[PDB]
Design a protein around this ligand. Structure first.
Ligand SMILES: *[C@@H]1O[C@H](CO)[C@@H](O)[C@H](O)[C@H]1NC(C)=O
Ligand SMILES: *[C@@H]1O[C@H](CO)[C@@H](O)[C@H](O)[C@H]1NC(C)=O
Lengths: 49, 50
């Protein structure tokens, strides 16, 4: 029942250290499309807008 | 003590390594110094006894 970031404290545990050794300046987030790009539905084809 | 998967050493006092994780066996063992203590001599006067 919290739309935004919740109030509280949670410490983030490390997951992995990748020796990528590359140069990073920009990043982008990948999403999943449940609907169809060929035929877009009027509504509800995606996930609750 | 429980070490997180990335944790290897332990320093609660920040100047002495109390605990560590053994490299071969993943058990965690804590290091206590070999101990010490002052030694006092209680003597009467050597003019009386040694
Ligand atoms: C990373 O690339 C930028 C150009 O986008 C460059 O200015 C920067 O010096 C590069 N950094 C490294 C560590 O290669
Ligand atoms: C490391 O080797 C030791 C002794 O053979 C054994 O406890 C265990 O199989 C290995 N543990 C790790 C860190 O893979």
């Amino acid at each position: 029942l919290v739309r935004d970031l919740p109030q509280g404290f949670s410490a983030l545990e490390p997951l992995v250290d990748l020796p990528i050794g590359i140069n990073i300046t920009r990043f982008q987030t990948l999403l999943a499309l449940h609907r169809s790009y060929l035929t877009p539905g009027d509504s509800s084809s995606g996930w609750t807008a | 003590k429980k070490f997180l998967p990335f944790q290897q050493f332990g320093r609660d006092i920040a100047d002495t390594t109390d605990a560590v994780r053994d490299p071969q066996t993943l058990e965690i063992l804590d290091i206590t110094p070999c101990s010490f203590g002052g030694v006092s001599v209680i003597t009467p006067g050597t003019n009386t006894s040694n």
